[PDB]
Amino acid sequence: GEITFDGIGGLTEQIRELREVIELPLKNPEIFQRVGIKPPKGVLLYGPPGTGKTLLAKAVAATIGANFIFSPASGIVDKYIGESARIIREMFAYAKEHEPCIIFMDEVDAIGGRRFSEGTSADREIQRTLMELLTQMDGFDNLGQTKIIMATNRPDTLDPALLRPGRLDRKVEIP
Amino acid sequence: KMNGCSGADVKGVCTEAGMYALRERRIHVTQEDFELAVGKVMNKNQET
Amino acid sequence: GSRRYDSRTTIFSPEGRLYQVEYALESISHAGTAIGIMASDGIVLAAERKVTSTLLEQDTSTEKLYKLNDKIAVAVAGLTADAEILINTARIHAQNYLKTYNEDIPVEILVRRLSDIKQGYTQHGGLRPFGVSFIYAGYDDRYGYQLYTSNPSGNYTGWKAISVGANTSAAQTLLQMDYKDDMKVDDAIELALKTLSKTTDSSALTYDRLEFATIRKGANDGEVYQKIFKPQEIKDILVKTGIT
Amino acid sequence: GYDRHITIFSPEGRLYQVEYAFKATNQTNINSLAVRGKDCTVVISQKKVPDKLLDPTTVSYIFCISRTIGMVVNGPIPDARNAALRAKAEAAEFRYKYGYDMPCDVLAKRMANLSQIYTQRAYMRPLGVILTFVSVDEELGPSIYKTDPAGYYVGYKATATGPKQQEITTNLENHFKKSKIDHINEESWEKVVEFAITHMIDALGTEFSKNDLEVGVATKDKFFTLSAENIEERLVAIAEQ
Amino acid sequence: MSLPGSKLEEARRLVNEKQYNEAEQVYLSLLDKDSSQSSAAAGASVDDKRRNEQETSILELGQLYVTMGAKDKLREFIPHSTEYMMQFAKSKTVKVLKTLIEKFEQVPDSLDDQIFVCEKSIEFAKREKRVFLKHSLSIKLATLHYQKKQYKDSLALINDLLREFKKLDDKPSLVDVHLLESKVYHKLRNLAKSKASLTAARTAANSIYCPTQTVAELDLMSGILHCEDKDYKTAFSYFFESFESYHNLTTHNSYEKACQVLKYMLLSKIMLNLIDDVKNILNAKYTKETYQSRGIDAMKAVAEAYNNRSLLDFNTALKQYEKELMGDELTRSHFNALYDTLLESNLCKIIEPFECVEISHISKIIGLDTQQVEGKLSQM
Amino acid sequence: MTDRYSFSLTTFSPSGKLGQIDYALTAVKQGVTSLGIKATNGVVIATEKKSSSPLAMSETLSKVSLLTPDIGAVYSGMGPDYRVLVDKSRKVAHTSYKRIYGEYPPTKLLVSEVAKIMQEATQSGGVRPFGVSLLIAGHDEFNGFSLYQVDPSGSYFPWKATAIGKGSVAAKTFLEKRWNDELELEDAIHIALLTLKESVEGEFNGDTIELAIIGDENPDLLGYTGIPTDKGPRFRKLTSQEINDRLEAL
Amino acid sequence: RDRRERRLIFGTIASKMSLAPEADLDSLIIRNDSLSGAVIAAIMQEAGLRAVRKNRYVILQSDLEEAYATQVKTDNTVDKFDFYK
Fold first, then answer.
1. Which residues contact E59 (CB under 8 A, 6 or more apart)?
2. Are G7 and E237 in contact (CB < 8 Å)?
3. Which end of chain G is least crowded, N or C, by CB within 10 Å?
4. Taking the domains of chain C in order of start, what are their residue ranges?
5. Closest Cβ opposite residue E192 in set B24, B35, B36
């Protein structure tokens, strides 16, 4: 990491509960194996833009020791043929090679939304992102050594399909 | 027994009739299985 | 073309016909098929009903047939909430003639008056017009029995055997093939139940969904009387005609 | 929004004008509390302190319609003064035509029926405030009727207006559950204010001075609003018991 | 007294106060004695106001006849009521004759009188109401064959009437017939006709209505079919669902019907072998419903025998409690399964090391006689 | 979405049915569930009430009002919509009838006048339709007992059993298959309590549930004695304390 | 769903995890209404997530009840009546 704990101070009550479900499975994966449960994957950190998004991103990777991966959602949806298909695969391939890593994102409100029937209407790259992110965590091969982090202004502006249990288990507001 | 049964529902009710025959372990579909198969396709075709 | 203003009735369409009248004919076909019959000795009225639910009480409620006076009974097709406004308006104006001239109002006068009442909304003002299919059935001493139909355009047309609602062109052909110039009362009743077999979506032809009213000039003391037959009596004539 | 331009029920069955009507109630960010003693009803509203160019005494969120009757409004100010002058008209006209004291039940019901007339008129804006009417009935006794911006009114044992109402109801629910009564003890109306201040501070989590609050008192055939010096006497009276 | 309403309340307390013979004469005085005015169709008295208190008295007296041994008199009293069917309650024989036969179901009675009555009053003028209701009296006949343990006559009455059961008489009557049909092939060890009749009963259960006892029996008949098919994780799932319906019946439920359900729920727990969850049923008063005996408590020792895996404590409670624990036919099929399960676990301990050991030493490890071990060991 | 002309009450809908009508039922569907059961000797009505805050008074909300002693009513929807409608409906019932025929209006005449106000609400521009659906139960000497389902569009139809709100479609199949016209009012009360219980199982007591029936006259509710000719009020609204007594016998 | 029918999901997930003998399985089947196995599996999975926070491998009754209040409803927009229609 880069940012230390002194900047994220005041969240200690919340951070203490987050490190137990994040820092522990990255260091000693056998902690939850004896219990018989699985660690959470997605953790949602949302708040005002520029406040708490950058601090909590580099602070978590500093205390754990895992590398800091910054892959904003603004590098996904564009005009291209199958862009969002190869972004997640190469991002999943980098986390597969180096285990001690944690992926962070930014401004995920543009890649989300449920539309109506959860199909595509005049948005090409949004639906490919919604399904692929669901198939990576709930598929046969997930990231146990890498946690997915998203950042937005409000959780209600995202797709409820990704907010269901099994992928995003944590909603944390940044005051 | 039906009204306006299309070609897709005919192959469907014949498929349903073959399912009740597998539960009876009989290579032939008895007349009792048809009365149970016609009742299912009428409610299936009525929806939507 | 691409620019269409349907909001106000005052705006003329590029084709020349208001779009509210175009889609009003669809609402008529969405309702039940109603068949009027004009005979020499009376008027036979047979129509189905839109509600297929068994919980609704169809014996004590009539969705289409309504009696304006002793010599006039009409069948309404269209929006139910918008129908009661024109039904009561027709009954108030009909009593004003009897209150003044002490006579029964002729059919042609009532038909032309109601045609302008519906037209008044489209001709002036911003109020919504009510698309309704009327079946005009009555008798007088001028032209005798008159069968008229009220289109959403606001006009009327004379008819002998005419059907509205669903299968309009299909029911009109069946009535003309067996049509008779005299149109016997007993033959008009069998002609109505025979046409309602193919046209209506219900092959069993349930009695509760039918409205059967027969006008006869051969009533007591040679007068025109309108009798509303209960659905229990409608099931009886189904066996005589061979439906059941 | 193709269907958003007007006030109708929308294709989603959701009124979007009510969406911004409730948001305007929290624009002032004022938290009030309304409790009812056995023989009395005491309401307390938070008085915001502006700069020195304004008079805090003239600032009041509680209006007096008549004796024993009072109105607690939390929301936009310009809609509060226009509704205050209108609520008094129905109170005086009812005491003339029907010749009877207008109860808070009908007083909240009349504003609810008047609220639909506002929605019925496309050129008139519905009330975007929270109308809380309190009084002491001759028969039913103390009663609270709060009229929502949508026209809903229902009786409340102890109500509140603000974002902290969730925490206010929790502390007041267990207080009335142990005693199994909706009225505060100590029938003396002077001691009822002591509890209304005590239960409010722990519910809001912030203690306020005499200049941060205003305390109304509705007794039988009498109503008055405590001044700045009378509120200070209430805090001193809490320590003496 | 001399009143139709006074004789009902006064004679109610005279049964335990003195005897049932003097109280019986009070009801008989209302029927035959006097009570003649105007003209009416009764067969004993003459009045239009006596039909209510006389038919109610027959329902109360009919229950006391079978208990005290008067059933020989009661069987001839019912056919004499044919004249009342043309007056009382505007026909509706199903509300009288069917209830009189129901009185024989509560109190144990022989099948000679129960069959004779149902075939007696049907031949009289009561058949006017029984035209379309003839299926009701036919079900009562097929029910009596279950106590006879003869399923040939019960199946013959059902099959010939199956052609009239589909939308020709009574729609909900199907599930009642398909439920009793599954019990016919259950004792015959036929799983093709039992699962077929149960499937038609459970599928049509949403298309018609059933009482509380019938809906709970649909799961009782579904879970019992999992005994021979194993899969004991979902077997008890249908057993506890039926107990919720049988618990609220109270007086409507008998002592034997609720006791068998307690034995069926504990039966799947022994096959699944959960030690903590098998004792919680007897400990909790909600699931127990206060049923305990020597055979009920012996089922807990059967589950405890699986903990140590020994046939010493298994056969100890088996031969001692055999009067009760072995009374159930369904659990009897599982006794040999549990006997071979605990034995096979002990045999694997001998087979795991090298072979060629003394047979007399093998019986000492098992704990049974030499002839008993050689027969079971060679069977596997 | 497609055409606003369906939403405009001064404009005919291009789809054949006004979008304002269909989406007004969604507002009624979003509300609570209200039902009714019509029997031979009476008609029972039952509905669930808003709990709101835990300190909210349960005795303040009454969803069953009094029109005439022979006719009851129940509603599900917005609060002020029912109040403004009936406050004017009670005046029309008295002016058009009681000020002419000097009695309490019958079932057919009263219900027909209630729908006329909804007709003007869906016709004149700027006036939004009502967001409530009134189930009216009454008894007269001509048609007898009657149960009419009044939709915000202004079209009423007789129904032996019906439901409105979110459980409208769910309870419609239930009340159709369970209930028969040949039963009585006593069995109608028990069925109405079981179907309404399926909506929410949290509190079935009389605090959140109102119960009222129609039937013969009650001499205790007449208010005066000595006149055998005039019958007592035919409508009796059960007190929430008396509702719990019926629930124990359910 | 049914009170006893859902227990098949509770008993299956509990067999793959460590739970204290004081844990009440009957309190979950009565309180839960119309829920699937995905919601039930999240309750027992959160019990382990609440256990690793306390550095206790054995899940006690306290970790079971505290995990039920979090996973009971995933909808943040509920409120109660605050927004009509």
1. E99, E100, E103
2. yes
3. N
4. 1-244
5. B24
Query: Is E5 part of a structural domain of the chain?
Result: no
Across D168-204, b (16+ Cβ under 10 Å) vs e yields bbeebeebbeeeeebbbeeeebebbbbbbbebbeebb
Place of tokens 């209200």: F34
Q: 3-class SS at E269? A: helix
Is E42 a domain residue? no
DSSP 8-state assignment for residue E252: G
Domain assignment present for residue E208? The answer is yes
CA dihedral E26, E27, E28, E29 (to 10 degrees): 50
E strands along G6-79, which residues? none
Pairing mode of beta strands A168-173, A42-46 = parallel
List domains and CATH numbers for chain D. Answer: 1-241 (3.60.20.10)
Q: How many contacts (CB atoms, under 8 Å) link D and G?
A: 14
SS3 C3: coil
Domains annotated on chain F, with CATH: 1-249 (3.60.20.10)
Cα distances (angstroms) measured from residue E330 to each of D194, E195, E256, E314: 73, 17, 15, 18
Can you give the residue range of the structural domain that contains E295?
A: 54-380
According to the entry, how was the structure determined? cryo-EM
Q: Do D9 and F27 touch (CB under 8 A)?
A: yes
DSSP letter for each residue of E277-334: HHHHHHHSHHHH-S---HHHHHHHHHHHHHHHT-SHHHHHHHHHSTTTGGG-HHHHHH
Q: Which of D9, D121, D154 sits opposite F52 (nearest CB)?
A: D154
Q: What is the CATH number of domain C1-244?
A: 3.60.20.10
Chain G contact set for D15 (CB, 8 A): 84-85
DSSP-derived letter for residue E244 is H
| Interface residues from chain G to F (CB-CB < 8 Å) | 33, 80-81, 84-85
The answer to whether F45 and F72 have CB atoms below 8 angstroms apart is yes
Closest residue to E192, CB basis, from B25, B35, B36:
B25
Q: Is E376 contained in some domain?
A: yes
Element (DSSP H or E) covering residue C95: helix C80-101
For chain D, say whether F131 makes contact (Cβ under 8 Å). yes
E273 interfaces chain G, CB cutoff of 8 Å:
no
Q: Are A104 and A57 in contact (CB under 8 A)?
A: yes
